[model samples]
Target: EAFTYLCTAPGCATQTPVPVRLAGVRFESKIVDGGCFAPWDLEATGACICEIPTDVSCEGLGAWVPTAPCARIWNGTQRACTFWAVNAYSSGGYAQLASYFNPGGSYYKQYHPTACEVEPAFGHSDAACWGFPTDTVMSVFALASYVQHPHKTVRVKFHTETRTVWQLSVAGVSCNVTTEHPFCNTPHGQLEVQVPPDPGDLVEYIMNQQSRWGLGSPNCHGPDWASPVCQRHSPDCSRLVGATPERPRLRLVDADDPLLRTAPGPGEVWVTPVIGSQARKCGLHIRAGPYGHATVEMPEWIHAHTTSDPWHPPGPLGLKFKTVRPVALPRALAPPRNVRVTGCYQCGTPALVEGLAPGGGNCHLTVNGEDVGAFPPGKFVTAALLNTPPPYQVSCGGESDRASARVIDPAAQSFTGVVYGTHTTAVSET
Candidate 1:
């Protein structure tokens, strides 16, 4: 007979051997079970009558048992399910789903972070000022580390003081300036002398010329063209384009024409006096005492300030030089290689790895998605492979090498038996 047991009165005790029948028929055995039922045959009942105790007090506060797993949360937020998520959660509840499904270890553990911060912007270094009369116009490079905006850019423009003068940006912090002196009026004629002085004579004459001009040393020599300062006043060996005997002399003059005046002044050369009243008056005296012999007077003997010979100013005409600063941008370095994986195994089998390391570093190897060891730069790595897994990621210097390949059939007949189908192999097994 079938019977159902029920709890008796609260705090009540059960009576042993108290058998009950479903009907008036003689039932051999019966069993009724529930939370309140005691162990079977506990009281040695003649039938399968389970006993129960009333002191249990079954009613109380209950706890919630999870019917399903709780959400995988991070920072109080649900985490992503992507492989990257496993890496993202690596700082916490990390697990490799690839390994879970395949049972083989991780083929590789590729760790990639955000792009490196942009390198500070820079420009060319020292710049040279060509065609200068004094020391070459040069200065230490000035640099500016400007801020780079996202999705925006800045440009550098190199320019010159004049169209005739151009600048060259050789590279970072290296530049040169060039110029073209146009074919035009040059004062070659203005430097003419009754007698061309010899080297020693020219040196003394130039030195005296400088003393009279208050322009300081005439650091000049026989080859007057060797010095721009000297060429400014004296008859230098500087050649002119398309020059002729009839054409006026072509020479470099100062900012103000000095030779045409009555006396040598700043940046002017001294020669015999030009035809004018002041000429004879200031003319050189060979011997001032009645055609006899007095102290010989020479142009080199006097300073421009001591000279009593007055100078009549000429019309203003001269040359001026200009300079400028230029700008340019420095270039950046190249990026690293991308990684790839191939091969298939059941438990633990062989797999072929291909691709490159980040930033051209030694390509560290990984099997079953786990790091194993390293190989040389750009060199392919081979190691133990597992049958159940899929990925084999390579990484270097925080950058991850990445790629995908069709599952290789371990039993396939080939040199790399695991490699299947037609796959582009960057590096060979040898």
Candidate 2:
């Protein structure tokens, strides 16, 4: 039969004939901006942009923007981009795109990096550009990456709660069996796969569910399942458990299972960030051992709600008080361990004078219930989350109250900031 298959998605009904055989077509992918999507519907350049526009720029010099910028968008998240195309595959089948090999249409590569969008990145694969599968939408996500090290068998998992049993395919290998599929239900209601550890450390999850039938998807898309299955990342995948409501199914699990490996198991699997050909320090790594040690090492208290002596916000902020106000340390004895230095807490605005200080009814300041002179202002007044501070303060009004607040850590005191009609207040939490 001639190559090329019509669209097989739900609403797709157009058929495009192929000039060559199924295995004769191939395509190449190029990296662009980190924000760009697939290169099918748009040109490769359109898929990736170099810089994200903050303030509108002059015309002509502007670059193409990715469609999904605001959604899952990060400051400088993209590393590499790619493009793919198939020449001509057998008419009317998902096999057309699936069978295409290298650009020369020669031998198929053994293993490929996990698709973009899934666990790690969850990238999108645009099938609409190809035909026959027009109505169908397929998004391929790399359930895992950077940890696909050889001899380090790791399982990649997908969580779905649907009653219909699904099939599993990876790299060109199929795991679905007849009568009873390899991906059957378990007490945990999840699918588990024990992959032989590969040092390449690549794990990908592709969802090939059905978007259309009758055309060719019913047969070519699957043994019985349809094309474009539901591929997703389980929230608890790191725990080697299915995140879906189903039982303890594991798609991509660790290599410690008795059937997979002889050893007991490592703690949480650590996934390192990939930088060029080498691994970087950032990114999540899975370690296998126990749940307690599965997290990244951070300063004493990270991610926990934090408080501050003097809270601050962003961009030319100030505080204003109508009447007399007191500046002193909190009644608490000590500063919280994780109080962000660059954060803005509370302050009085416009001015501070002996009797002129603004007081909104009963206003008093004390540190550990002691008077303001008990401790250095550095212990009570400070900024957080910013490199600089406003250049405003109460000038003591030439009074004997000028007991210079000892700033033990010069780095802890304010540099240059002002207090005015718009000062920030502290956020209190138990």
Candidate 3:
């Protein structure tokens, strides 16, 4: 691989390669006479990098004139040795050349050196940028309500520090698990785990069939023979249940079933409650004792709706809900605590302002249009009243108003000056 370096200094225009050696190949050299230029010692005499006209002179000294975008030279002088550019950067030089380079007057010479870098035409890199993966977990969970109204399905996506973990799609009362966690139901609605349980906080839930009024289906009667008959009715046959025939069917273990036979091995398990397919109502109830805690704090309920449209689109009632917990947070790593300035006080002779900064920072004080000084939080500072007469108006960081006190001959009175904490219209007398 060949890499090139060019010199783009103020005057020397060396667009050639610099001599260097890579692995074993020898590189060509472009630097001339210790620098980029040997032509009239361009770098030494500080001559303009731009081309000079045939008729232009530098020694005979006449009026300076703008000949090009940023070129200026003596109208009549010997070109042997002369300075041309005023401000090496074109911004100020062009304005100076256009204004001061008069038509027929004595010329003035000005020069400023500005350094510029050269762009490489060829370079070698080991890998492509942005190819590396990042370790930042970002996730969002949403719940769908009123599947009875024939609405779009709810899709929940989970991501890890690298690739996506899973996307759980729930529609009606059926939740199709397209991907796997440590263990979850597959597309066939069967509990399966191809990998051993990972070390971290894991959560699982089973969508349950329910009535529009938030009622649970009856528990399986067990013994295999009565299972189908038990699944057909509600837990309470004496109470009212969903009369709708198309209630979506749900599959999973019982909510109260033990998540683990023993305390989870270096991990914790959380089982979410059953979600139902009903009109405007939904409920999720799960046990917390199986995990580390005997009680769980679920996120607040979510409510959503849709308008009636083309594909049951214009007016469909739906909703979404989500809950999240950090899977693996270290014990020592904690968020920063609150830092605030509760109040401010001005004290001392010549009136200094003191501020309460729980977190240390500069607290400013002003006295009669001048900056007294800046003091750190929980510090006492002197006001800027140097040589200024009192009845001095003082104010500190974010105080409502300036304060002033009546100065009635400081040498004789017990109270030299009054500190009113805030600035307001009132009379202060001895």
Candidate 4:
């Protein structure tokens, strides 16, 4: 009665039994990392199946990691499969975008960048190239791709699938109905919701169907079909469901309860989930890492923008190598409209802002007259946003306006960081 959706499929003459089959399985890293089946189980964080270790961190810390598995299973073709590209908040190719937001690598000046494991910059989200080239667009699929396969030698690994489904709780007036989930076939079966049979035709199809009897043949139906009883069928749920088949359905990750929205029709109808909240354009954090570390805007040809990029399995990675590894351009071709700057792609930015956020620990911030807001205890900010145009400050117990002494690409790029005293917070993304 509470939190459960009773079946709402239609009723009819005896229906053919729908035998169950292995439906589908999807990849969801956080669930594996935290050992919890959220969304469906809901309250994911409040509870845990196992303890996450201290040695490991989300690396780049966010509800979703850039290299998080492409929790995809739709068609191996949608955004989950193929990665697209587009600039963020601004346009006009790399050069123009970079200079506008970064202007001669401002953040780099404050702190000369370096690279290391587990996202040196805490609290950064959606791999916008760590804000390099500062406007490279993004890809829910590819940003993580770059992180995982850039060279193959240095790699992080983990994998698991969140077998899911789209349960259409066809509420009310249910006799015997049919439907399929978005990800896989129905656990129940295909019994079309055709209108009622001629005034009382003997519906054998409505007889003791296994799924109708709950988990297969238990005879839950009453004496006669006189009351027009409602029976449910999940044609899209996975036959390979874990724990309870009735519980593994998909949900829109961006907002609200997975049970909140319903389809508007003859009765209350529920459907599938989607990764909404379009904040997709990501950029690179140029010169943010060790300056001469080398950057490749386009990785192999197909990897740049293709459905064949690498969704499930360690496809072609390490195997598929583009002959020439390119470098970031300072004065090169302007990326076309809607086109990308390699690795970056177009898709739902991760729901990193999922659940309650961490307390804004410390680091009251400011820069170039713009209020840069507060950061978590780690005080992570995309580098450029922190070090541009000097006078920038992070007011924590320990402060710094430390200048960069890195190689001179931003040559005159120097700012005696907080000799004037400021908080020493960790910068991230870049």
lDDT of 3 by residue, 80-184 (tens): 222222111223332233233223212322222111111111121111111213321110011111111102111111111111122122221222221232222
Instruction: Give the number of the best model, judged by TM-score.
Output: 1
Q: On residues 77-97, what C-alpha lDDT tens digit does candidate 1 reach at each position?
A: 111111111111112223322
| Cα RMSD to the true fold for all candidates | 55.3, 33.4, 41.9, 35.3
Q: Over the stretch 44-142, how does candidate 4's per-residue lDDT look in tens digits?
A: 010000111121122321333332333221211111111111223245433223222242333322332212111111122333333345443422212
Distance (Å) between predicted and true CA of 97, model 1?
A: 68
How displaced is residue 178 in candidate 1, in Å?
A: 69
**For model 3, where is the 10-residue window of minimal lDDT?**
34-43
Residue 321 accuracy (lDDT) in model 4: 12
Q: Residue 53 of model 2: what lDDT?
A: 18
Runs of candidate 1 exceeding 4 Å displacement: 1-338, 381-383, 408-430
- Cα error, candidate 3, residue 234 (Å): 99
What 10-residue stretch in candidate 1 is worst by lDDT? 40-49
Where model 4 places Cα greater than 4 Å from the true spot, the runs are: 1-130, 142-216, 220-430
Score candidate 2 by lDDT: 0.21
Which whole-number lDDT from 0 to 100 does residue 293 have in model 4?
A: 26
Per-model TM-score versus the true fold? 0.16, 0.16, 0.13, 0.14
Error of 3 at 127 (Å): 99
Superposition error at 165 for model 2 (Å): 65
